[PDB]
Design a protein around this ligand. Structure first.
Ligand SMILES: O=C(O)[C@H]1O[C@@H](O)[C@H](O)[C@@H](O)[C@@H]1O[C@H]1O[C@H](COS(=O)(=O)O)[C@@H](O[C@@H]2O[C@H](C(=O)O)[C@@H](O[C@H]3O[C@H](COS(=O)(=O)O)[C@@H](O[C@@H]4O[C@H](C(=O)O)[C@@H](O[C@H]5O[C@H](COS(=O)(=O)O)[C@@H](O)[C@H](O)[C@H]5NS(=O)(=O)O)[C@H](O)[C@H]4O)[C@H](O)[C@H]3NS(=O)(=O)O)[C@H](O)[C@H]2O)[C@H](O)[C@H]1NS(=O)(=O)O
Ligand SMILES: Nc1ncnc2c1ncn2[C@@H]1O[C@H](COP(=O)(O)O)[C@@H](OP(=O)(O)O)[C@H]1O
Length: 371
């Protein structure tokens, strides 16, 4: 649960000089009395300043090379670095008020609404909400908690990019905003609009087994009709053409699962390097490895840990653990009791997707091992 980076001489360059934004470094030693008194104050500050400041320590007895390069002749010393250059210093023991006065006087943390620098564009039912919720565990990530539907709605898109920006949450300059809008993946007119706004934007795609995703899709549409006391057909009657007895390519649930078909459209405007495909099947069984890849994709330091995720045998999925008294599980619409589909139909669907799946692996570079 520790939020303080433990530094060494060998790690100082990568963790401090090559870090983005603001880092406060405490130079300390076991023999330094005031260092010990101030140590818990830094723990409080690391929580209160999450998103604007990272806190780090270097033990100068164990790592004696770094302090002489900064002329440090007494400890505790607090050095505030920004982008590899010393920004401010404080010498000696100080109280919380002096430190907060020092930090507030030295950090340019204009809380601002910024346009997203990463967008979860799909795919619906692949775990888009879950992915967004998990990425928000990173101190530098700030989520747009509602779908805004900007690029897929001519009405909203007419209001201009500024309207979109002012629909984003407040964040600090050094924070990265992430939006989730599954419909963007399928809406045919959306890649050009996003490309125009920011051609270097990063795009996130979350997928799970094609056939499974279609059944999850069907279940939601079914629940929506049963809620309103309406009628609906069985999955089989919709996914299989009655006449030919083949897969019904006109059914949206099936078309949406042909991930490759949609990706081709997006690739006409963005290079594959700007995309990262998250394995939704692995996100359910073992999230952390998939989330750690997203961290590197976003140029974010490793900060999501195994402590943040815990298995809830009751709900049957993983839930989020932020601090010691803030837990959050996903809503009831996440984790629906799927209907049993005739094994024969499932086999036909699996074979149908197979060639599209192999193309997807080849284009994206990630083999997801789907049946
Ligand atoms: O098909 C027909 O018959 C249509 O025919 C036409 O000719 C007629 O004219 C129409 O009248 C007929 O309408 C029906 O069919 C259309 C088309 O469907 S389509 O073919 O699939 O396209 C239906 O319209 C579509 O309905 C979709 C749907 O999924 O129902 C829409 O999908 C998008 O939007 C939904 C709804 O979002 S929202 O309103 O909530 O904003 C998304 O599903 C919800 O996702 C949110 C989410 O943000 O994750 C969930 O919110 C939960 O979680 C929140 C956060 O919690 S936590 O952090 O996880 O812990 C929490 O704050 C919420 O409280 C919580 N909700 S909860 O209920 O309390 O649990 C919701 O749970 C999800 O339901 C969906 O992901 C999104 N997908 S997208 O499209 O890919 O973007 C779609 O936009 C829309 O066009 C029409 O409804 C239908 N009418 S009928 O059923 O009456 O027949
Ligand atoms: N920790 C988690 N808790 C609940 N559902 C999760 C989850 N991680 C992934 N999911 C999955 O994400 C799906 C919904 O994705 P989306 O938010 O894009 O609609 C769920 O569909 P099911 O209801 O079919 O299980 C479920 O499989």
């Amino acid at each position: 649960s520790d939020k303080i980076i433990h530094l060494t001489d060998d790690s100082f360059d990568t963790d401090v000089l090559k870090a983005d934004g603001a880092i406060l470094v405490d130079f300390w030693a076991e023999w330094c009395g005031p260092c010990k008194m101030i140590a818990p104050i830094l723990d409080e500050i690391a929580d209160e300043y999450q998103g604007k400041l990272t806190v780090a320590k270097l033990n100068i007895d164990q790592n004696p090379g770094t302090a002489p390069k900064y002329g440090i002749r007494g400890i505790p010393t607090l050095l505030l670095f920004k982008n590899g250059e010393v920004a401010a210093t404080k010498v000696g023991a100080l109280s919380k008020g002096q430190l907060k006065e020092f930090l507030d006087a030295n950090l340019a943390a204009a809380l601002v609404q910024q346009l997203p620098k990463a967008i979860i564009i799909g795919v619906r039912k692949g775990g888009t909400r879950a992915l967004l919720e998990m990425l928000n565990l990173h101190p530098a990530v700030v989520k747009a908690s509602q779908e805004i539907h900007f690029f897929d709605n001519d009405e909203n898109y007419g209001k201009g990019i500024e309207w979109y920006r002012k629909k984003m949450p407040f964040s600090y300059p050094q924070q990265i905003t992430i939006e989730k809008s599954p419909a963007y993946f399928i809406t045919e007119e959306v890649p050009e609009r996003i490309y125009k706004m920011n051609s270097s934007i990063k795009l996130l795609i979350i997928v799970r087994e094609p056939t499974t995703r279609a059944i999850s899709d069907y279940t939601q549409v079914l629940e929506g009709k049963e809620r309103k006391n309406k009628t609906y057909y069985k999955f089989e009657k919709l996914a299989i053409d009655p006449n030919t007895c083949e897969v019904n390519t006109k059914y949206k649930a099936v078309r949406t699962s042909i991930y490759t078909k949609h990706l081709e459209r997006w690739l006409k405007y963005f290079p594959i390097e700007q995309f990262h495909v998250v394995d939704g099947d692995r996100l359910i069984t073992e999230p952390l490895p998939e989330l750690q890849l997203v961290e590197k994709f976003l140029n974010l330091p490793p900060r999501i840990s195994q402590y943040n995720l815990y298995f809830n045998a009751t709900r049957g999925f993983y839930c989020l653990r932020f601090n010691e008294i803030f837990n959050k599980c996903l809503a009831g619409s996440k984790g629906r009791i799927h209907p049993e589909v005739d094994p024969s139909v499932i086999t036909k669907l699996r074979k149908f997707f197979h060639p599209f799946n192999q193309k997807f692996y080849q284009i994206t570079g990630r083999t997801l091992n789907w049946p």
